[PDB]
Amino acid sequence: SSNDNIELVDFQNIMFYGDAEVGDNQQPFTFILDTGSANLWVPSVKCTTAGCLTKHLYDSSKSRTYEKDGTKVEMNYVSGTVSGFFSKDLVTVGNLSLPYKFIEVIDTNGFEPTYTASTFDGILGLGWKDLSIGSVDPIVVELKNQNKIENALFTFYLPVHDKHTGFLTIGGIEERFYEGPLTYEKLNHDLYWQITLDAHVGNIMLEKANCIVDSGTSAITVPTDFLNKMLQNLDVIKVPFLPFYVTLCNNSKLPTFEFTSENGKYTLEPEYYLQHIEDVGPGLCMLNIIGLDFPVPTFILGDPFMRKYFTVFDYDNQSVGIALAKKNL
Numbered sequence: 001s002s003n004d005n006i007e008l009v010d011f012q013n014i015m016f017y018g019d020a021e022v023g024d025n026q027q028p029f030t031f032i033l034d035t036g037s038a039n040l041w042v043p044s045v046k047c048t049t050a051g052c053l054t055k056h057l058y059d060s061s062k063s064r065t066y067e068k069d070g071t072k073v074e075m076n077y078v079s080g081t082v083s084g085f086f087s088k089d090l091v092t093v094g095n096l097s098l099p100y101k102f103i104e105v106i107d108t109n110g111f112e113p114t115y116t117a118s119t120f121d122g123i124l125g126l127g128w129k130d131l132s133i134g135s136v137d138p139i140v141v142e143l144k145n146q147n148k149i150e151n152a153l154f155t156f157y158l159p160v161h162d163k164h165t166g167f168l169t170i171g172g173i174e175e176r177f178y179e180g181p182l183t184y185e186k187l188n189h190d191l192y193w194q195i196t197l198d199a200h201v202g203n204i205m206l207e208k209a210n211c212i213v214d215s216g217t218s219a220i221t222v223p224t225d226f227l228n229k230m231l232q233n234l235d236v237i238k239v240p241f242l243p244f245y246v247t248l249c250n251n252s253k254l255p256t257f258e259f260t261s262e263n264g265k266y267t268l269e270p271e272y273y274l275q276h277i278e279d280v281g282p283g284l285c286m287l288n289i290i291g292l293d294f295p296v297p298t299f300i301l302g303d304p305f306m307r308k309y310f311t312v313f314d315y316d317n318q319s320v321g322i323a324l325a326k327k328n329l
């Protein structure tokens, strides 16, 4: 009764992948696991783009349980876009497996140069029902309505460079994951794992500002103007043309993000957002922070933030629970 989960592997510290399998043959696929996208895709063997020639492709021939919606699709991210068509089939996960409506992909063209650069094969969305293209029911919620899960939640324990592995468990909470009390944050929404936190860094603040908690984002994002107020006299330096900064790893001026709610207070310290890049130069870190202006002032608590806090996404309680992870194995 050790619960079900999936092994998810640190990729150099930037981001992580859980491998999973569509088709009764459990056809291989390495994925991104994104809270924020509500749809899962994989690249068909009918794929016509150079992108695809890199990792594993779906042949629906080889599936016994294959059904075809056949309706043409185009999945859009901010990072770019994959397009294909809709299909059905069962998809196993850890010890658990069911029949799902998913987007067979045949076109990476507009997801380069990042996809053909990556190792992951498709993006398992983990988002919300009303946000699915083609009306799709989220996985975790199906495992409940199908009584296959003990609660309709999913729990994210993220890995660390050469330190320990990571585990997305789906139903119940594994205690060995966190120390200090889980704090639940209400969704200020009904399509997105986003809450209302009061983000400060030094003199600078924002208060009552949507914070998205996205598994498929490998940075913090910050309102551009807030990020500028942030960097005033801090001895960091934008890369030319790229919206990324670099700095000495030792830079003592690098702040500590602090987030307040009525309920709980959370904090990010440089070591979690600094990204060593010796590859360039000595004790030279890249910041893992991007400036990004929505219409309403918003942050995105991604890999750095999560790799800090054990984090639980409960559909039924329309909340994200947060507490501090453990050190190692």
Ligand SMILES: Cc1cccc(C)c1OCC(=O)N[C@@H](Cc1ccccc1)[C@@H](O)C[C@H](Cc1ccccc1)NC(=O)[C@H](C(C)C)N1CCCNC1=O
Residues within 6 Å of the ligand: 032, 034, 035, 036, 037, 038, 076, 077, 078, 079, 114, 123, 214, 216, 217, 218, 219
């Ligand atoms: C879900 C959705 C709804 C409406 C509109 C759009 C554009 C929507 O999709 C946007 C979206 O999900 N983007 C992010 C978060 C989001 C939601 C809304 C607006 C903006 C962002 C995130 O969740 C997933 C998305 C896709 C992705 C692509 C390649 C590898 C991994 C992930 N990842 C990224 O874009 C991220 C950064 C740049 C945000 N990213 C880029 C690569 C490398 N790693 C990384 O961290």
Ligand SMILES: C[C@H](CCC(=O)NCCC[N+](C)(C)CCCS(=O)(=O)[O-])[C@H]1CC[C@H]2[C@@H]3[C@H](O)C[C@@H]4C[C@H](O)CC[C@]4(C)[C@H]3C[C@H](O)[C@]12C
Residues within 6 Å of the ligand: 078, 079, 080, 112, 113, 114, 243, 290, 292, 293
């Ligand atoms: C999402 C934001 C853009 C926000 C914005 O607001 N930018 C204007 C959009 C253009 N228009 C004005 C025409 C929109 C339509 C008009 S409208 O007025 O309707 O909005 C853009 C700006 C810079 C972009 C990143 C960098 O590239 C580097 C990198 C390249 C990879 O490959 C993919 C990942 C990554 C991290 C990129 C992600 C994302 O992509 C970023 C954050």
Ligand SMILES: C[C@H](CCC(=O)NCCC[N+](C)(C)CCCS(=O)(=O)[O-])[C@H]1CC[C@H]2[C@@H]3[C@H](O)C[C@@H]4C[C@H](O)CC[C@]4(C)[C@H]3C[C@H](O)[C@]12C
Residues within 6 Å of the ligand: 191, 192, 194, 210, 212, 294, 295, 298
């Ligand atoms: C973008 C459109 C609205 C149309 C629009 O954008 N109308 C004008 C605004 C001005 N712009 C921002 C275009 C100026 C760009 C100037 S530029 O300098 O780029 O040229 C709106 C409509 C619904 C919105 C999403 C949902 O809520 C769910 C979710 C909430 C999170 O919290 C943030 C992510 C997400 C996916 C939202 C993103 C975005 O918010 C959407 C697509």
